[model samples]
Target: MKMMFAKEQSVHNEVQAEAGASAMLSCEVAQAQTEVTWYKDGKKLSSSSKVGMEVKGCTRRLVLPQAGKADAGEYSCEAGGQRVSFHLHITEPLE
Candidate 1:
């Protein structure tokens, strides 16, 4: 419900994933006990087999399992008043 710690990924950051590979995006908040919310293109996300949420102390992680082309997009997080985001880029395998 409420948060700072700061990092590049905690703001406008970028991450990459190979097609069919896993991708993880992480951000840091201010408190460990606070709950962090995740959004994809402004849509609220729930932990699922496709993507999972991880929280430790004031840090939260967004895990995308076996990310495909469609998974490449904006992923944002919020805690208290602090908000962070990362742009996921999907790349083809070495060819």
Candidate 2:
């Protein structure tokens, strides 16, 4: 089985924010001939994840909605024993 994003995707190289708002981390998996599994910081992150949190399907796609500060870190998407990882960065402008 081959794993890939239906469309090429990217993580923001920079996160810009003012205040009282949130950032997003989009972990997109597409054309998954096999089931897709997600991980955060070398640990499994799923609907039942206890260490952290993850959201289920939305908008005909899977999303990790309302990701915040602690959510900032390396994330991976795995299928067929292959994996792709990205980093989520969150920040607020220096005042």
Candidate 3:
């Protein structure tokens, strides 16, 4: 059987976060027979409590409720052995 997987990987939405607001990072897959997974800075996101993850409607989302400076990094999503990554940039108020 031919393994069906995400042929093309992509990320949507320009994430703009302030000091106190939340940010949502979206990772989209283009296949039905594949499982979607999330990663942070080349590490498994499951190893952190500061990050919240969920998958729905062929979309995998990483949620940061209280986005901090440390949250700014490269985020990745793997679907069907294929991977897609995005740079989560966080900006704060200059005081």
Candidate 4:
């Protein structure tokens, strides 16, 4: 089956954010029953005070609060046998 996406679609293949700020990564699936997970580089990430996830209908989101340099890397969402990824670049806060 073909995958479907919400009108907003998924995050860019590469995303940039500032340190001490929040970032949101989202993706859409063909169906609500679709299972998906988030990964940083190759390690899996879960919801927490600093990071969290949300799902509604066919949309899934990963929230990163107070992002830092350590948050910079490749992020991906895997669903079924498909995997979508985005490169995140977290820079220092502005003066």
Candidate 5:
């Protein structure tokens, strides 16, 4: 089965955060039962204490607590052969 994004949703989005702050990235899938996977710079992401993933109904959310510069990268999600991508940029806090 081919996976498709929900209506009015696009992968062309950017998430900006300040260093040592929280950030969230999310996407909605047309098929809720389809297995969803997260990637960063083309590398698959696994759940961890610093990072968390949640799938509820047709939406998927990725959370980052206390984001750092290293967290800035290309992020993507895929399901049922369909993919969507976004970029995360973490910058230093304003003085």
Candidate 6:
């Protein structure tokens, strides 16, 4: 009897943000040496004063600055040779 197999997770999320607030897109990897990258739609992203990037242990985070309507898109991350996307939904806040 053989029932040993390796299964990887490809789950994503639907992240929500305010029109003028911020958003946090995060991902984690099993190995610390694994390189993780971030992208929007299909374009690679960079870390700057606006978009902040940080790695705590094996976890990676893409800090979106002042999320706006334009920021509403499918964000993705590459971790351990696996890719997952999270759609950012920008909502207009009410008073």
Residue range 6-95, candidate 1, lDDT tens digits: 544455667677886776666665555467666776324665544566656656666667666767678766767767767878776632
**Model 4: CA > 4 A from native:** 1-5, 42-44, 57-59
- Tens-digit per-residue lDDT, 12-89, candidate 2: 354543322344444444545455565565334555443324443521222444444555567656656555555656
Model 5 weakest 10-residue run by lDDT: 42-51
Is candidate 1 or 6 superior in TM-score? 6
Candidate 1's C-alpha runs over 4 A off are: 1-12, 28-32, 42-44, 54-60, 92-95
Global lDDT scores for all candidate models:
0.64, 0.47, 0.59, 0.66, 0.65, 0.63
Cα distance off (Å), candidate 4, residue 3: 14
Give the range of the ten consecutive residues with the poorest summed lDDT in model 3.
5-14
Residue 20 deviation, candidate 3, in Å?
3.9
* lDDT by residue (tens digit), candidate 3, 29-78: 55454666566763356734646766556666676676666666677666
**Clash count of each predicted structure:** 2, 0, 0, 0, 0, 0
Error of 5 at 44 (Å): 6.5
Write model 5 residue lDDT over 1-95, tens digit each, in one string.
Answer: 56565564546677788887776666666664576766766224565644665556666666667667777778777767667667878786633
Model 2, C-alpha of 62: deviation from truth (Å): 4.2
| Candidate order (TM-score) | 4, 6, 5, 1, 3, 2
lDDT of 6 by residue, 39-77 (tens): 676324655644566655645667666777666778767
Which residue pairs in candidate 1 have backbone atoms (N, alpha carbon, C) closer than 3 angstroms, thus clashing?
A: 4-30, 32-57
State every prediction's TM-score relative to the real structure: 0.58, 0.44, 0.52, 0.65, 0.61, 0.61
